[PDB]
């Protein structure tokens, strides 16, 4: 497990509240406020999930071997409802639970480049106390292409070799604003931002 | 950390290895099939050596062994499929998003008996009459009865909604099938090519 994590004392899961003024808090706040300056952060929690981390790190090493470069990982946003937060914290992102996107590039889990997109009430639905929830997520975007609404996996790179797949898809390869991933353990929920108007 | 019985792959990460008829391994797998499918004709048995699928599976097995505090979480089951799905399963394993009836939930189905997987609706005969069935290592873990429309196994106690059963079945006392809902809970270990 990463050496900067808090000691969980044999436990496999912990949410750690970050302190404003620490570099770790400030980098996430700045990434958020770059496009969400009209909202205010209540708190930022580091997600320490040993099993999700292990499974994600195995997929990352595999993708780093296959693609024969790094640059497979992006830090993206995912807005969700309060009812989903316990499941995501413990089990991560499940495509079987994903809603249809208003612009669909495939049947998978969606991640935004900009916090403003994830901050829409459609995604980060305000709870009964007006709190909105957004994850900051390590996503294995790898090698990507423009998606299509019918996809249940990324498309093949070559139609004559249908099993050799792109890693993810996007809305626009030249100016990506979202990514869709179709497999478990391709996304690690790293931070949970709780925020309000 | 690849199994001793795998054959050398000359520094590659994926190989389908045809088994030698009459040796220990071929005999063991053939016997599991002929237990219930002795009226079929076996063309060949192939060992699936997929390093990445194996790594991902072994990590989930180690996690399930810790979570359940025992090492009885794995079963050897059967899965019939059509010829056009075989290259995908060999490379990528099983995908619940590529669904036949799903009465016990929206997962991947595995049969206890090869005879069940040998039905033409599962192991669809190709243009040459050939049928395809995997012998699969499945992390069934702690299981409960399934039902239509599950996207994950149910919780073990509704007081902790995120502490789930590992798999579901048709019948907890005498199971004939299992359903798993997560990638890398099943490792396709052998592919049997056969005819009626
Ligand atoms: O071998 C199989 N390959 N693909 C399947 O979908 C499958 C499904 C299966 O049980 C399906 C249930 C039986 C009663 C209602 C639903 C058993 C085996 C296989």
Explain what the structure shows.
Chain A: Residues 1-197 form the PARP catalytic domain. Chain A: Mono-ADP-ribosyltransferase that mediates mono-ADP-ribosylation of target proteins. Acts as a negative regulator of transcription. Chain A: This is Protein mono-ADP-ribosyltransferase PARP15. Chain A: Belongs to the ARTD/PARP family. 2 copies of one chain form a homodimer. In chain A, the strands form 2 sheets. The first copy, chain A, has a 5-stranded antiparallel beta sheet, with helices on both faces. Chain A starts with 12 loop residues before the first strand and ends with a strand. By secondary structure, the first copy, chain A, is of the alpha+beta class. Chain A has one domain (1-197). Chain A contains 4 helices and 9 strands. The interface between A and B is medium-sized, with 27 and 28 residues. 6-(cyclopentylmethoxy)phthalazine-1,4-dione (89Z) binds at residues 78-80, 100-101, 103-104, 109, 111, 116-117, 122, 177 of chain B. The site of 6-(cyclopentylmethoxy)phthalazine-1,4-dione (89Z) has 13 residues of chain B, from strand 3, strand 4 and helix 4.
């Amino acid at each position: 497990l990463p050496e900067h994590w808090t000691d969980m004392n044999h436990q496999l899961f912990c949410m750690v509240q970050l302190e404003p003024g620490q570099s770790e808090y400030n980098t996430i706040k700045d990434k958020f406020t770059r496009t969400c300056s009209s909202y205010a952060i209540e708190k930022i929690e580091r997600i320490q999930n040993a099993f999700l981390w292990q499974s994600y790190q195995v997929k990352k090493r595999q993708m780093d071997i296959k693609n024969d470069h790094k640059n497979n990982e992006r830090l993206l946003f995912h807005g969700t409802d309060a009812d989903s937060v316990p499941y995501v914290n413990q089990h991560g992102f499940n495509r079987s639970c994903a809603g249809k996107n208003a612009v669909s590039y495939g049947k998978g889990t969606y991640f935004a480049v900009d916090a403003s997109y994830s901050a829409k009430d459609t995604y980060s639905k305000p709870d009964s106390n007006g709190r909105k929830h957004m994850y900051v997520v390590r996503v294995l975007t790898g090698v990507f292409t423009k998606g299509r609404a019918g996809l249940v996996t990324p498309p093949p790179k070559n139609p004559h070799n249908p099993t050799d797949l792109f890693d993810s898809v996007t809305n626009n390869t030249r100016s990506p604003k979202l990514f869709v991933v179709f497999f478990d353990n391709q996304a690690y929920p790293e931070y949970l931002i709780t925020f309000t108007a």
